[PDB]
Design a protein around this ligand. Structure first.
Ligand SMILES: Nc1ncnc2c1ncn2[C@@H]1O[C@H](CSCC[C@H](N)C(=O)O)[C@@H](O)[C@H]1O
Length: 270
């Protein structure tokens, strides 16, 4: 029944990422995935490696052939798009509200020799410039819950997908109804609420996988990485970034209530 509970504007979100990007890159050792890792065992792989696994799982579910056009909704620094573009002859349109991320993503594309397959733009997902029925597939890897009006973005994605087009969504969720923003600033949402918003917009749900048991290593491991780079965060990156950093390192107060969802949905055929 209930959908995504519904905040910062898209410009404000872009600004926050403009500010925090250099810190994330520093922690990661370069432009990085900005999503949780997925582990096969008891947390052995680095979070970067585990994040690449998540990317690969999403690509498996969404890139069904060569020669398709894919919209990466909230593309971060473009690292996941470029990972997939290395080995898939497809066209990815990556959109983000952060001009810092656009610039980094486009440079990375150039450096890697992948700009024939991937391009990046500063575009608000709540208002897409694209015609109806433009894309074979889409990703929203931890982007929908950052939006002021996620339902609006979901309807736009449905609009610009072709009939039968596939959407893959990942998100940090409240694992279960037992026991509103997380201390990191992320909107609190159940996977069940995300599903209901997708359905309500007109998507067919193909699959939901609750993978909370595979991703639980992320917050502790990323916090430890962050803590190494924590000196002078407030003076070097600004107080907003310092507040966010403090929240991540405070993960023991809340992360046990978090889980993770991989959703596959499609625009009805026609
Ligand atoms: N309204 C909006 N329109 C487009 N992108 C948005 C948006 N609100 C937030 N985002 C983007 O969503 C991303 C969240 S971080 C996820 C990044 C990427 N999908 C990854 O997996 O690495 C950021 O790039 C942020 O700028």
């Amino acid at each position: 029944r209930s959908g995504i509970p519904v905040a910062p504007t898209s410009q404000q979100v872009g600004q926050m990422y403009d500010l925090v990007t250099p810190l994330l890159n520093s922690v990661a050792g370069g432009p990085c995935a900005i999503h949780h890792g997925y582990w096969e065992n008891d947390g052995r792989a680095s979070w970067q490696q585990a994040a690449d696994r998540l990317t690969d799982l999403v690509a498996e579910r969404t890139v069904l052939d060569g020669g398709v056009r894919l919209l990466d909704v909230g593309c971060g620094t473009g690292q996941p798009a470029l990972r997939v573009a290395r080995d898939n002859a497809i066209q990815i349109t990556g959109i983000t509200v952060s001009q810092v991320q656009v610039a980094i993503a486009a440079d990375c594309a150039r450096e890697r020799g992948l700009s024939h397959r991937v391009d990046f733009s500063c575009v608000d997902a709540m208002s897409l410039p694209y015609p109806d029925n433009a894309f074979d597939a889409a990703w929203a890897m931890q982007s929908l819950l950052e939006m002021s009006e996620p339902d609006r973005a979901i309807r736009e994605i449905l609009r610009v997908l072709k009939p039968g087009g596939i959407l893959g969504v990942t998100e940090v969720v409240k694992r279960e109804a037992g026991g509103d923003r997380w201390p990191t600033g992320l909107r609190i949402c159940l996977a069940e609420q995300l599903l209901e918003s997708l359905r309500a917009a007109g998507f067919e749900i193909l699959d939901w996988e609750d993978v909370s048991s595979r991703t639980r290593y992320f917050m502790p491991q990323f916090a430890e990485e962050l803590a190494a780079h924590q000196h002078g965060i407030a003076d070097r990156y600004g107080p907003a970034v310092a507040g966010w950093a403090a929240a991540v390192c405070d993960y023991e107060k809340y992360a046990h209530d978090m889980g993770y969802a991989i959703l596959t949905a499609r625009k009805p055929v026609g």
